């Protein structure tokens, strides 16, 4: 395990804000974004197409554990969680990224926002990918992939083990 | 062929408004509903949860043809439009029923708003079923069926050749 | 004060469901409506524009107190209260009307779903106006009217004591 | 006039892409939002309350005329165009800031983005105020301030004589 670094190459400070943007791509950052109508919560998460849209900042935090460090290693389990000021639907839910358990999750479940901290699908590890500056994340269901979304098709992030789906991503210290 | 009935017995008039209500239903008529979110054209058709909501009106159109007659036969090739004089979106598209033939329609696709009037997409039947007063509505991809959509689960009609799936309707005589 | 009829001249009845709909018009039922975006609670009151459209319906009971009758009568104080089984959104408040009391309230004020049983803001009188079977709604911030409102211009209901703006309606039993 | 200066001091050049960013703010850049619900379209101009949310890109053309130059001047006047392949609505009109002249426009009329480059109301200047780098757009109606929009409160650009109204922006060239 090795510690992961952002794209202006300095290790990943835990709980510090940063930008996930999908390597080699036109369009911007990760973002909430509604994928049912109604109900409209749990969020999901979605690659903006918009170019310079950087993404919504999240922050990396160990569970469990880890008393010995300020810095994000990977193939270790963490929490992911959006960092917003304003909030301004889906309230009764937190900002962490969770894996979509519920009785309705597709067989390549999407993933949503509002997990709880210490549940086994709000488990996330970073791992290197081919790629400078370049990984992947994985949890207890799957590789973080995409399929087209629902906004004018736009990458929707969902589990799953099929390795032609993999989001490959870089991490933007948010300055 | 027989004569298509109303609610009240009386035949089915060609261009006259009709709701079209699913029988044995705490739900009410069908009604223009977003079935995507980005593009929401063409919109898709859905019955209301709303017990005391008629739907929207439609009137029926044969198509080809016959000139013998004012009513509505079954086993005869119709056009369902919506009939509203308000319509603030999707008005590049007519209020025509038809199946979705798109790149992107699913296995069991759904009904569209937006046909073109001589398009083999665009054209009905209504048939008898068992008893009242009671209808089901065929196209050449299939029965008009239901399936659990994205307004809270609110039943959205798509052409089916699953059985178990038949909407069952009368049409009810606008005032 | 009067026994209070429906538009098939019977007598209301407390409890008993009623669409609320504006005399004279070419369009449907009050129905709620998001008045503001973002935050869209409470909801404000607006009359659909769809003509066969009849309104969610209502129910009056009266505050306070009353223990005498199962009939409304006019220049008395009551709750005006929507009655649906759904209700996806707003629903840390109740359904009865209210007029907006809020620090943001408009010189005329809006009303909005959400009041209190007891407060003074939701308290409304049934007046007779002249025409068989209409009626007026008052309220101790003035008679509800209307102003075009942000649904492509349909009326939104208001507190105001301009005498042209008074709302007239009549109340259609839910059968 | 003197040349209009981006946000590391180098002159802003005819067609290239900045974000307008308004000084001394927690929150991000401007960008198209809808500021009526029902139509939606034209579209307002609202400050993002998102910290790291930059806005969308705009550019700045000579209207009229001018063939000297390379570069933008202040006191003179210019179309100002959001530029975005992706457009997914009010696709009949521009992409062009323009004051809203039409019938129901209020008294300090919204900026809407929708105009004609000849017409006088698509027609702003860049002016220099106090520091930085920091700079204020006019028109014809009066200077481009803002007032709490239908976003949560988000700032909504209009056109105002009321000089507390007054929005001090910074250019920052796009990447
Ligand atoms: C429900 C709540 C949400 C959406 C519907 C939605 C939804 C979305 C979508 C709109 C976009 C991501 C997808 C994309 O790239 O779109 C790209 C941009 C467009 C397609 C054009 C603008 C779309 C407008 C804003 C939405 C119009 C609503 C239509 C008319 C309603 C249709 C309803 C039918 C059922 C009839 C987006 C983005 C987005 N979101 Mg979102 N998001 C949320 C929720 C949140 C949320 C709580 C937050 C933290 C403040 C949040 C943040 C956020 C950020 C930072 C960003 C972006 O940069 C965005 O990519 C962006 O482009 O915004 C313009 N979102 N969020
Ligand atoms: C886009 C355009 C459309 C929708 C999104 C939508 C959509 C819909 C839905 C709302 C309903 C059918 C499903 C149902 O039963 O719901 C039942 C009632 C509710 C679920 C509660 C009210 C929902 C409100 C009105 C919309 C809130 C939208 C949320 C906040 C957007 C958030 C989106 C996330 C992605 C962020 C409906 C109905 C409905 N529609 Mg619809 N419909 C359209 C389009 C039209 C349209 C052109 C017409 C001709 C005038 C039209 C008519 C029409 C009629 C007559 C009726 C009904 O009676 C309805 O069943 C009804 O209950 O209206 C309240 N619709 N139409
Ligand atoms: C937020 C929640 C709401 C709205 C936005 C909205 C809103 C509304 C509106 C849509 C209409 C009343 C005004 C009217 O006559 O419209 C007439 C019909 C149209 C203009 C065409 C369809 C509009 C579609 C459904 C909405 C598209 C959403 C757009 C694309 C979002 C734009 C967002 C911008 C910021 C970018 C309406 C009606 C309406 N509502 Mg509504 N309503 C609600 C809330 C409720 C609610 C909890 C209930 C109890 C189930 C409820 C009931 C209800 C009933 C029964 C009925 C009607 O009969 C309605 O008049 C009707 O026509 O529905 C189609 N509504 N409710
Ligand atoms: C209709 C079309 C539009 C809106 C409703 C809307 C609307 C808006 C709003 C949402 C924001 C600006 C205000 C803001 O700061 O909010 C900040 C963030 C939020 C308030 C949380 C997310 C709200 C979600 C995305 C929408 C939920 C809609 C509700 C559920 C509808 C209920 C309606 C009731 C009547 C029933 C916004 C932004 C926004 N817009 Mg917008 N925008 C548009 C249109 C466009 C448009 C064509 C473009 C070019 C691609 C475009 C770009 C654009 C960009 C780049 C950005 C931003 O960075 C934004 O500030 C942003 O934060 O996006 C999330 N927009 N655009």
């Given at each position: 395990?090795?510690?992961v670094?952002?794209?202006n190459?300095?290790?990943?400070?835990?709980?510090?804000?940063?930008?996930?943007?999908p390597?080699?791509?036109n369009?911007?950052?990760?973002?909430?974004?509604?994928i049912?109508?109604?109900?409209?919560?749990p969020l999901?998460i979605?690659?903006?197409?918009?170019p310079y849209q950087?993404?919504?900042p999240?922050s990396?935090?160990?569970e469990?554990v880890?008393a010995?460090?300020?810095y994000?290693?990977?193939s270790?389990?963490?929490?992911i969680?959006?960092?917003?000021?304003?909030?301004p639907?889906?309230?009764?839910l937190?900002?962490?990224?969770?894996?979509?358990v519920?009785?309705?999750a597709?067989?390549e479940p999407?993933?949503?926002?509002?997990?709880?901290?210490?549940?086994?699908?709000?488990?996330f590890?970073?791992?290197?990918a081919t790629?400078?500056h370049?990984?992947?994340?994985?949890?207890?269901?799957?590789?973080?992939?995409?399929?087209?979304?629902?906004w004018?098709?736009?990458?929707?992030?969902?589990?799953?083990?099929?390795?032609?789906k993999?989001?490959?991503?870089?991490?933007?210290?948010?300055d």
């Open positions: 395990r090795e510690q670094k952002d794209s190459g300095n290790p990943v400070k835990r709980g510090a804000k940063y930008f996930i943007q390597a080699k791509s369009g911007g950052g990760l973002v909430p974004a509604a049912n109508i109604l109900p409209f919560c999901g979605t690659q903006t197409l918009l950087p993404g919504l999240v990396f935090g160990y469990p880890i010995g460090t300020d994000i290693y990977t270790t389990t963490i929490n969680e959006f960092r917003s000021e304003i909030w639907v889906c309230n009764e937190s900002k962490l990224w969770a894996v979509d519920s009785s309705s597709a067989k999407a993933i949503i926002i509002g997990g709880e901290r210490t549940a086994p699908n709000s488990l590890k970073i791992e290197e790629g400078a370049t990984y992947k994340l994985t949890t207890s269901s799957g590789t973080v992939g995409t399929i087209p979304g629902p004018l098709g736009a990458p929707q992030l969902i589990a799953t083990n099929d390795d032609a993999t989001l490959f991503v870089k991490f933007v210290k948010v």
